[PDB]
Amino acid sequence: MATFVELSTKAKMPIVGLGTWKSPLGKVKEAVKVAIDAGYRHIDCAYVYQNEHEVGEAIQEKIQEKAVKREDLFIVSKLWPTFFERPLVRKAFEKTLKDLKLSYLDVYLIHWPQGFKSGDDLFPRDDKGNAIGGKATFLDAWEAMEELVDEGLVKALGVSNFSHFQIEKLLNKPGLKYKPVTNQVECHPYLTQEKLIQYCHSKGITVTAYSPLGSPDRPWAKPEDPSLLEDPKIKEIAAKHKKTAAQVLIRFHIQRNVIVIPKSVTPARIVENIQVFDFKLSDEEMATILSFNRNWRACNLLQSSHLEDYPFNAEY
Numbered sequence: 630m631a632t633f634v635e636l637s638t639k640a641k642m643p644i645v646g647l648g649t650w651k652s653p654l655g656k657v658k659e660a661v662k663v664a665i666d667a668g669y670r671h672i673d674c675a676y677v678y679q680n681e682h683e684v685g686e687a688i689q690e691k692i693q694e695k696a697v698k699r700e701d702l703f704i705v706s707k708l709w710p711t712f713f714e715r716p717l718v719r720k721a722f723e724k725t726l727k728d729l730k731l732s733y734l735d736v737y738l739i740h741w742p743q744g745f746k747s748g749d750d751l752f753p754r755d756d757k758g759n760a761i762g763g764k765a766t767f768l769d770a771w772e773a774m775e776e777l778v779d780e781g782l783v784k785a786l787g788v789s790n791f792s793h794f795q796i797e798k799l800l801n802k803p804g805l806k807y808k809p810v811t812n813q814v815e816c817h818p819y820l821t822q823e824k825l826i827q828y829c830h831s832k833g834i835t836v837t838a839y840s841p842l843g844s845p846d847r848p849w850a851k852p853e854d855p856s857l858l859e860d861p862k863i864k865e866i867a868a869k870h871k872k873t874a875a876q877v878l879i880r881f882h883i884q885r886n887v888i889v890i891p892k893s894v895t896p897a898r899i900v901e902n903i904q905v906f907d908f909k910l911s912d913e914e915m916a917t918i919l920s921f922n923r924n925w926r927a928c929n930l931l932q933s934s935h936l937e938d939y940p941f942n943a944e945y
């Protein structure tokens with residue numbers, strides 16, 4: 630059975646969710662439909678993925694067809710940092726919610742802590758491709774997002790790609806109404822996030838692991854980049870359980886009580902990826918996997934590294 634991680638709000642967040650970044654139009658609706666049929670309840674979405682309108686169609690279909698009730702779904706989206714100015718937070722949210730055809734979101738995340746130039750150019754950049762910053766901050770954004778929770782449009786807020794310093798800046802903000810329920814960050818055996826997970830858990834903040842398979846189809850991959858799915862040592866552990874590497878990579882997070890959101894539009898893989906509750910990695914296997922840490926990021930966003938709130942300069 631597909632288990633949950635309890636949030637600070639007492640809401641139950643399904644521990645495996647479906648990722649939707651780069652899920653193409655014409656495939657993402659079917660991906661969400663297959664996922665819901667396979668027992669997924671948690672779907673991870675974003676404004677910047679530009680496919681929320683199709684995700685919304687799929688969700689609406691399955692609810693209509695009595696496959697699932699809204700209350701049993703757990704829908705997450707994210708505020709892109711070109712929308713940190715107060716009026717833009719509301720407008721960006723309204724587009725996300727309208728696209729998803731929902732009356733509320735379960736969690737709404739700040740997608741990245743660093744502010745970008747405000748507006749509807751999602752990737753404002755210079756000639757070299759470096760991100761253009763904006764003066765509105767994640768605290769400005771949070772302020773506007775808190776209204777959504779007051780109004781019942783969002784059940785809980787969270788953050789993504791925040792370091793512990795940025796989470797501290799948020800938690801210690803005088804006059805804070807709502808606390809983040811999760812920090813969605815890259816996490817897998819090459820980036821085990823031990824210090825950040827410990828920190829977040831100590832503050833009652835869950836962690837959601839993105840790119841758990843190493844994001845093998847990311848547009849900026851470099852052939853010398855490591856490959857988790859083909860890693861002989863990961864494969865060895867998979868073989869031990871007669872499971873696939875992907876299932877080991879997903880189960881890894883489950884055993885750390887970390888939510889994990891593998892992306893697929895392939896029905897067989899969508900099913901495979903949630904077949905992770907009928908085996909257990911041994912204490913020794915978990916220790917071996919943790920030892921693979923390389924501090925390697927598939928998502929380092931180097932093009933924003935000059936910005937004030939770029940999160941990856943800190944140790945954690």
Ligand SMILES: NC(=O)c1ccc[n+]([C@@H]2O[C@H](COP(=O)([O-])OP(=O)(O)OC[C@H]3O[C@@H](n4cnc5c(N)ncnc54)[C@H](OP(=O)(O)O)[C@@H]3O)[C@@H](O)[C@H]2O)c1
Nearest residue numbers: 648649650839840841842843844846875891892893894895
């Ligand atoms: N907050 C953030 O900044 C942030 C950053 C990155 C990602 N995310 C979220 O996290 C989700 C997951 O991360 P991700 O999409 O970067 O990468 P990922 O889930 O690590 O890997 C996805 C890739 O692996 C393939 N795949 C999926 N299941 C497989 C399996 N069982 N065997 C072999 N290959 C498999 C997929 O192929 P097919 O789709 O062709 O099947 C796709 O190419 C995203 O979709 C997004 O929702 C958030």
Ligand SMILES: CC1=C(CC(=O)O)c2cc(F)ccc2/C1=C\c1ccc([S@@](C)=O)cc1
Nearest residue numbers: 650651677678679752754758760928930932
């Ligand atoms: C890491 C990353 C993700 C993954 C995710 O959030 O799920 C992503 C998703 C999108 F729909 C668009 C951009 C990004 C992205 C980094 C990024 C890439 C190029 C630019 S501009 C420089 O071309 C800016 C940022």
